[PDB]
Amino acid sequence: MRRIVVTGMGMINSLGLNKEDSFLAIAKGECGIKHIESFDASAFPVRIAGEITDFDPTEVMNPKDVKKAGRFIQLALKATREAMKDSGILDAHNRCPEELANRMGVSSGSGIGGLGNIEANSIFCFEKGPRKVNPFFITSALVNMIGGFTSIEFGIKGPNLSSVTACAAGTHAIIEAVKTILLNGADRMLVVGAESTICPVGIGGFASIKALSTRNDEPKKASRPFDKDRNGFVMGEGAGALVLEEYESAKKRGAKIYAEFAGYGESGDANHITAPAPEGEGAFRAMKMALEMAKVEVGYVNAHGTSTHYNDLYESIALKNVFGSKEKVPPVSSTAGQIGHCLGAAGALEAVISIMAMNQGILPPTINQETPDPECDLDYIPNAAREKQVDAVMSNSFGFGGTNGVVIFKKA
Amino acid sequence: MRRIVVTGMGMINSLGLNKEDSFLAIAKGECGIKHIESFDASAFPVRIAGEITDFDPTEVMNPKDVKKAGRFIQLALKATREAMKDSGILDAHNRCPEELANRMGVSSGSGIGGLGNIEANSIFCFEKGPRKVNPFFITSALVNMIGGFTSIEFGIKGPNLSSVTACAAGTHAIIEAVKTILLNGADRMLVVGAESTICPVGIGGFASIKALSTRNDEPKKASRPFDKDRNGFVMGEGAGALVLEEYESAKKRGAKIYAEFAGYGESGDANHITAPAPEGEGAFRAMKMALEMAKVEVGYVNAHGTSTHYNDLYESIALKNVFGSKEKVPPVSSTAGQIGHCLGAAGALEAVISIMAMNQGILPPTINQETPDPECDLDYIPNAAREKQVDAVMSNSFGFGGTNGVVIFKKA
Amino acid sequence: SMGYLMALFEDIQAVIAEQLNVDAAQVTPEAEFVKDLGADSLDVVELIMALEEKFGIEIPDEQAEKIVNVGDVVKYIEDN
Amino acid sequence: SMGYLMALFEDIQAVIAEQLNVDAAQVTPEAEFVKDLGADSLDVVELIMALEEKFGIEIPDEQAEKIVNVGDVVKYIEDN
Ligand SMILES: *P(=O)(O)OCC(C)(C)[C@H](O)C(=O)NCCC(=O)NCCS
Numbered sequence: 001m002r003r004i005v006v007t008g009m010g011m012i013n014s015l016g017l018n019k020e021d022s023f024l025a026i027a028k029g030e031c032g033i034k035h036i037e038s039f040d041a042s043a044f045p046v047r048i049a050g051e052i053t054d055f056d057p058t059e060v061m062n063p064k065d066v067k068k069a070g071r072f073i074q075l076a077l078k079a080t081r082e083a084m085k086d087s088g089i090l091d092a093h094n095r096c097p098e099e100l101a102n103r104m105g106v107s108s109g110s111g112i113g114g115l116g117n118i119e120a121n122s123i124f125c126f127e128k129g130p131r132k133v134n135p136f137f138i139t140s141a142l143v144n145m146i147g148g149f150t151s152i153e154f155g156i157k158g159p160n161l162s163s164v165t166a167c168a169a170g171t172h173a174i175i176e177a178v179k180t181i182l183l184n185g186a187d188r189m190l191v192v193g194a195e196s197t198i199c200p201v202g203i204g205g206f207a208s209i210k211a212l213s214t215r216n217d218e219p220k221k222a223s224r225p226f227d228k229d230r231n232g233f234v235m236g237e238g239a240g241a242l243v244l245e246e247y248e249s250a251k252k253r254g255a256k257i258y259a260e261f262a263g264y265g266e267s268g269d270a271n272h273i274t275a276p277a278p279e280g281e282g283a284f285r286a287m288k289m290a291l292e293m294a295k296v297e298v299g300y301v302n303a304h305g306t307s308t309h310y311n312d313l314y315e316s317i318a319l320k321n322v323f324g325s326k327e328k329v330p331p332v333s334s335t336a337g338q339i340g341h342c343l344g345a346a347g348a349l350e351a352v353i354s355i356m357a358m359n360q361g362i363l364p365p366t367i368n369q370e371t372p373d374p375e376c377d378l379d380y381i382p383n384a385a386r387e388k389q390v391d392a393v394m395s396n397s398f399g400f401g402g403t404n405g406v407v408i409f410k411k412a
Numbered sequence: 413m414r415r416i417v418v419t420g421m422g423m424i425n426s427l428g429l430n431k432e433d434s435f436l437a438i439a440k441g442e443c444g445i446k447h448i449e450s451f452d453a454s455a456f457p458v459r460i461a462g463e464i465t466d467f468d469p470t471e472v473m474n475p476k477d478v479k480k481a482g483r484f485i486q487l488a489l490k491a492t493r494e495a496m497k498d499s500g501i502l503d504a505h506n507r508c509p510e511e512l513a514n515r516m517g518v519s520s521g522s523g524i525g526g527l528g529n530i531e532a533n534s535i536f537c538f539e540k541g542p543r544k545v546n547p548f549f550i551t552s553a554l555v556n557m558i559g560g561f562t563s564i565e566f567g568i569k570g571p572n573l574s575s576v577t578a579c580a581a582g583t584h585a586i587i588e589a590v591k592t593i594l595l596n597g598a599d600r601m602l603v604v605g606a607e608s609t610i611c612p613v614g615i616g617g618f619a620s621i622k623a624l625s626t627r628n629d630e631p632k633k634a635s636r637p638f639d640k641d642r643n644g645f646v647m648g649e650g651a652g653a654l655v656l657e658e659y660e661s662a663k664k665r666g667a668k669i670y671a672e673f674a675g676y677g678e679s680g681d682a683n684h685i686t687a688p689a690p691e692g693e694g695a696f697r698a699m700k701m702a703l704e705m706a707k708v709e710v711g712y713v714n715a716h717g718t719s720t721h722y723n724d725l726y727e728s729i730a731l732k733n734v735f736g737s738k739e740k741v742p743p744v745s746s747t748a749g750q751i752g753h754c755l756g757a758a759g760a761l762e763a764v765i766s767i768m769a770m771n772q773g774i775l776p777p778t779i780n781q782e783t784p785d786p787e788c789d790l791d792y793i794p795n796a797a798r799e800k801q802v803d804a805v806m807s808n809s810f811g812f813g814g815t816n817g818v819v820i821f822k823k824a
Numbered sequence: 825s826m827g828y829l830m831a832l833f834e835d836i837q838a839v840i841a842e843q844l845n846v847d848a849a850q851v852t853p854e855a856e857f858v859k860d861l862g863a864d865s866l867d868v869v870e871l872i873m874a875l876e877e878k879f880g881i882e883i884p885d886e887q888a889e890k891i892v893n894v895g896d897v898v899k900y901i902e903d904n
Numbered sequence: 905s906m907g908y909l910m911a912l913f914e915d916i917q918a919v920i921a922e923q924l925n926v927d928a929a930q931v932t933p934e935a936e937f938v939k940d941l942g943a944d945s946l947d948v949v950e951l952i953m954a955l956e957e958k959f960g961i962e963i964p965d966e967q968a969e970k971i972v973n974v975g976d977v978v979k980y981i982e983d984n
């Protein structure tokens with residue numbers, strides 16, 4: 001069918017403000033997880049998170065507009081600006097050329113978007129009445145306002161789409177973009193996943209279901225995917241961004257080619273609202289469907305690997321079953337140890353990370369591997385990055401509601 | 413490409429608990445707007461809404477699980493149960509047959525999902541700390557839990573996708589399901605748009621930007637699309653659901669065939685975060701791309717028509733422009749007078765309404781047409797339904813962020 | 825007092841029954857939540873919170889972790 | 905007095921300046937919000953809210969409709 005390439009990338013997370021600084025720190029096995037300081041978490045059972053402390057919103061938008069955008073959108077406007085410039089597509093005004101604008105869209109993803117803004121205006125309304133609800137509340141908080149602000153910022157007028165499938169949103173935003181190009185609804189798609197939920201009701205929500213790690217004393221050992229001492233995820237904030245283009249278009253305009261899109265898979269467990277399907281059954285089907293569609297040898301897997309008991313175990317089971325045996329599973333790592341699990345943004349961050357691993361022949365490690373889990377018996381690239389050339393990479397994402405998405409990119 | 417038909421439908425709104433009662437009332441020009449009573453709005457500047465007062469969640473859910481679902485999910489379960497039953501797909505245990513289950517997915521749409529749940533738990537946390545955050549908060553609130561709860565109730569394990577494009581989410585949810593089936597990712601999809609945000613911060617959010625009608629002294633004349641005395645929309649709640657099915661597989665099953673999918677269009681304005689593009693330019697392009705893809709004669713248009721100044725005006729201009737002239741615009745009606753504008757659910761509700769209008773040769777009116785607007789000069793089927801047979805229908809949806817979606821269904 | 829203890833038992837039984845749509849028939853001291861009452865990881869953590877909310881108490885996380893049956897929960901609350 | 909009036913005007917200039925992200929230079933009594941200050945429907949109503957916060961006011965909704973130049977707002981706050 002139609003062919004699709006990645007021509008621009010960007011990302012911002014707790015280990016870097018750009019994809020270059022971020023990936024290096026991730027491949028070195030550093031860790032951006034810190035103690036929450038965006039809010040007073042002193043009374044909370046969970047006081048750590050993958051916070052970005054160096055991010056300045058007034059660098060990506062003028063000071064008047066900062067109050068109109070939730071933090072996840074500010075992060076998205078940074079990552080997309082990097083990717084859009086990286087792509088070389090912008091004109092002299094830093095805007096998409098007019099003759100191309102109708103055919104370039106945006107596919108955005110977030111699990112919940114502007115939670116802190118909903119929380120704040122909810123409290124305003126509950127303390128002072130509705131007249132204290134700020135006019136900029138709604139458009140600062142809706143998930144699709146990522147595509148809203150980004151499309152106005154770059155003048156792209158193609159399909160403007162938003163995925164909100166929980167912790168798989170960033171991967172589904174990639175796939176919906178692919179589908180749109182494959183069906184000739186666009187020739188290019190800005191893709192961006194973005195999430196920033198480090199706020200009281202955000203941390204308390206995941207604490208009250210015991211989803212989060214409570215290793216507060218050690219923020220840099222808390223997130224440990226597949227380890228035997230894993231005791232919950234650590235919430236991270238960030239955004240990742242890709243530019244996708246139909247292959248001939250990219251060639252004609254002389255594009256940088258990071259990767260070619262190879263295959264995808266989507267499924268639902270129809271089992272449980274938070275727990276994974278037994279044996280990762282839904283994950284298995286999405287992974288098989290992506291592998292059958294890519295028809296390439298995957299040399300590296302970026303796992304969802306959120307540091308929970310069920311995900312790491314049921315994701316490991318599904319990986320064996322799809323590759324046949326534990327010996328046939330390619331090298332796997334989760335980078336959630338380094339930057340935390342970034343929820344709706346994870347799928348997008350981990351596609352950028354995975355393609356860069358391929359580009360550089362450097363496979364980042366899973367950090368904090370201290371005690372092998374006998375039931376998690378794969379090669380998780382423990383602690384130290386592996387220099388290895390791969391020709392294709394696969395990234396997995398699963399969300400509450402049992403929704404699964406998998407993407408495979410291959411070498412250009 | 414592959415052929416897509418509608419084989420089951422369901423809907424709930426402020427004028428009925430199922431599609432038969434509701435459509436009858438809507439075609440008769442009845443109005444479900446009333447005074448708000450689901451919270452204390454006595455100190456609010458807007459005190460009217462399309463509230464559903466006869467809905468009992470315990471009729472769709474085990475009473476013990478009502479607490480796990482936001483009100484928008486409860487409405488989605490009501491509408492999807494009706495459409496699934498209507499489709500004849502369900503087995504003796506009201507679940508999808510296991511050998512069809514992997515190829516039937518779910519495409520869900522909502523603007524914000526469980527806002528009242530986020531508001532309530534934000535307030536618990538602020539007033540009494542994170543130990544008062546209810547454990548069922550997150551999974552009651554996420555937009556994609558519509559697909560989560562429904563896929564579990566019906567045992568459908570195909571692609572599980574959610575659209576969060578604001579007031580166009582319901583229509584984009586249809587389009588993502590169509591795209592999924594076109595690309596062979598599923599043979600059937602359950603589509604459902606659902607929204608319930610009649611809560612203090614939801615009403616406060618929209619009054620803060622002066623988007624809501626303030627005719628609190630006359631709830632059933634407040635919503636009046638295209639009328640010269642319109643003064644803002646009226647918020648409604650509800651859910652619409654459709655079963656989409658590849659054509660050969662539907663005929664094999666003996667399915668009933670309500671309609672055939674004919675075309676769609678999607679675009680972004682890249683203009684303003686709440687106001688439409690000048691001359692409804694993004695709407696024009698989305699409508700043009702749907703009409704060019706359908707290649708049929710559209711005999712009725714269910715307009716977005718929310719009863720604000722801007723939409724009604726610029727939607728009318730874009731309609732004229734796309735059909736060529738005022739005389740060449742098919743009959744147009746907005747049913748938001750009758751049931752309110754239902755935000756993320758509107759596109760799903762209005763696809764059901766449009767298709768039923770086709771099925772029964774009855775075009776429902778735009779009600780409360782008392783004063784012609786010179787700038788709004790189309791045929792809006794004023795005040796009383798028109799008995800007229802049509803062979804295709806078009807439904808428009810636009811959302812904050814300038815995101816547009818259009819779908820056309822044709823007789824079959 | 826023994827009467828006070830029996831009243832506390834009645835209240836706990838009612839709470840476990842409602843939160844889990846189960847009749848007071850099954851809420852016996854030997855009823856384990858997952859096998860006998862049909863609960864899950866989320867229902868249990870939610871039952872324990874409305875206990876702390878209705879009885880104005882605060883079950884520390886360690887004791888909440890060992891809860892396997894209604895008998896155990898009631899005995900912990902009595903020890904309080 | 906005249907000094908009080910000057911202080912009030914300067915406070916209004918500060919709020920209108922921070923909200924619309926413009927110098928206190930352009931916010932003169934004859935400056936129009938949409939034409940001269942680069943504002944929009946959402947910016948004016950949000951500026952009006954901020955003033956109802958910096959100057960204890962509660963402008964009723966009908967008076968906010970007739971607001972074209974910064975002078976209107978300043979004179980309303982004067983009549984306070
Ligand atoms: P139960 O054992 O299901 O308890 C609920 C918890 C919170 C443990 C929940 O099921 C869970 O943590 N599931 C793990 C699934 C997972 O990590 N999925 C990825 C989305 S974050």
Ligand SMILES: *P(=O)(O)OCC(C)(C)[C@H](O)C(=O)NCCC(=O)NCCS
Pocket residue numbers: 579621622623684686687688718720721722723724810811812944945946
């Ligand atoms: P400003 O002149 O942008 O005015 C703000 C309001 C709230 C009037 C805004 O422009 C508006 O009306 N936005 C939505 C218009 C509409 O009806 N859109 C359809 C999607 S709800």
